[PDB]
Symmetry: C3
């Protein structure tokens, strides 16, 4: 049953690949670079020209990688939770993958448009850390939405170590999303970020806690609108609202609401 | 002789484990994730439920991991120093491990209490980067206190790369210590930090040096009291004193003494 | 032909090693730590006492490592480009290696002189992240100067992940260069940095881009003179000029020209 369901989702993803515009295609066999399991597998599956020898890109081989990835995530969700919760979480992931593939194309488009230094999508797809982070994040988020609270944090801790970008999986982020450079980025469990958000190194959208067992959870991180740019070093803290079309300056400390259509600096 | 001494310290650590409260225990077999030697081994030994299959947790297996760890550290201290200094340094480490185990329990307690996002200790213990850093730091510090100056910096450079947290091993840090997120954290060779210190990403407690061969060593980094919180981005520099119950704001630049019982921001 | 050329460059590098002053020499066999290919190989070749067992340091073994390194880089430049461009790029690299070796000695000298915490050069050479970054950067830069635009960014993305330091390979940096700690450092494609530059963690010399497909390339990052110090957290942005003998404070936001012989802070 889960195997037949995997076959169908691999088939959908194999066809989407086929019909992806030529910017998402390439005939080159690229250098093989082994990375942590969830990333390695999500990469191959979503953007096969860039990570698989041309000769091996086959609907069947894509199913095989999707199965390896499923087993691994199911194995890990089970360890921290139980077999039935795991089964249900992975079904959720499977259901959402076509959708996440679409969103990730849009994040690639935002990355190219936002980065005067990018030569083409092949480079972003292959090596841009912002993009590796978001790939894994969009998967870890489905797991958070299932109610899972352990393995999904451990996934993002793989991101955290590989890229120095720290996105809590409960964060809610829409498409055309781009983190440039990314080191020192931290995004909180209850962060909400809208469309076309561009974020630099050393930005925090989260919270701090001065001393005096702090209450667990609750909405406590910013909500950011659409078309927002947050400059290198800015710390945006608390349950505050940043409107749409806001550009925040470098090293800004934001602790109160920010109205739409502004530029903040000092 | 060192083998009999290792047996006794493993025995002490095997018993402490036994009597650890149930928050530090679990019956789950967790996913295996291989990490740099000193971390991999300190983890297993100190918090065996989280890193070892239940079936293999045996006083004997804990001695075996302690021996592997000893040999490795002794091998590495010898390379940079000499066999007798190495012998003495490792004896020091062995002597201090029960004590460091106690302190690390307290750091776990501070991490849970300080982090609205933490679900339980199993998660901190397994994957929280602040905590992996402190584990290795508390060991590297004993080596610094022995007078060693090479291998102990190289240990923390393993931390530095894995977690992007940069703690010089000569730093003196008490318990109930918590670094949240941690990327960009830098703590200097002569830093002194008291109890219940909570530190965010992008905090420096160290020093800078404007140009015009700078003098080696000497007390030159802050001394921080008890119950201090240092917000995301704060740079606290020079041989200055921060008193107890100080909360420092995000992006603050601290270069002069800070009296106890204050909040600093702008 | 490329093999005979490799023999000659290995021979030059084997002799330079021989005549390096004794600070760049050691009889100790140091602990083996495996790192990403380009770093692993550039290390061995340039500073053989620190990375090779004494018994194996032989003109011949240095040629063998230079050949492995050449093949790997040629293999990777070919993948993204074509065989003739690759051939020409690697010839360029080979031609520049003696020169880069000299510059890297000077960067070691700047690191020791700039860091009260450094015990000797063996430590910098072995484990200092600033230094691993610069090693790979000086090689990736030759590739950028050849016109290559893919593999050279992917090299520095290996740096980015290992060290959390992010230097675009088109950046132009002179000698006696030192990045201390380094996490969060970002240096832009058109950055120009003069001699004796000392840079701390969380410094950016690059650019940001507020929203509303941004133009590609063009001179857009700072140009920094000689003897400049840029303090922890400073963000220096845009096509601006920082003169010589400037010291910039912690967390400073620099967006306009800075005249020579100043100290900037607030």
């Amino acid at each position: 049953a889960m195997d037949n369901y995997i076959y169908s989702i691999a088939h959908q993803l194999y066809e989407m690949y086929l019909q992806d515009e030529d910017a998402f295609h390439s005939k080159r066999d690229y250098p093989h670079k082994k990375v942590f399991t969830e990333l390695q597998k999500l990469r191959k599956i979503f953007f096969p020209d860039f990570f698989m020898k041309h000769q091996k890109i086959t609907e069947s081989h894509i199913a095989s990688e999707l199965t390896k990835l499923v087993d691994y995530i199911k194995d890990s969700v089970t360890a921290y939770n139980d077999e039935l919760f795991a089964h249900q979480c992975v079904m959720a992931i499977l259901e959402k993958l076509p959708s996440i593939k679409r969103t990730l194309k849009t994040d690639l488009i935002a990355a190219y448009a936002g980065d005067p230094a990018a030569p083409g999508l092949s480079l972003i797809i292959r090596c841009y850390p912002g993009f590796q982070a978001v790939i894994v994040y969009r998967i870890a988020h489905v797991l958070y939405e299932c109610g899972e609270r352990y393995y999904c944090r451990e996934m993002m801790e793989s991101v955290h170590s590989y890229t120095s970008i720290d996105i809590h999986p409960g964060a809610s982020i829409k498409g055309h999303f781009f983190i440039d450079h990314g080191v020192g980025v931290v995004i909180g469990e209850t962060a909400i970020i809208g469309e076309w958000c561009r974020i630099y190194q050393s930005v925090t959208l989260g919270a701090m806690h001065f001393q005096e067992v702090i209450k667990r959870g609750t909405k406590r991180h910013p909500t950011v609108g659409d078309y927002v740019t947050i400059g290198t070093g800015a710390k945006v803290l608390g349950n505050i609202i940043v409107g749409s079309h806001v550009r925040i300056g470098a090293n800004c400390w934001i602790d109160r609401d920010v109205d739409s259509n502004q530029t903040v600096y000092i």
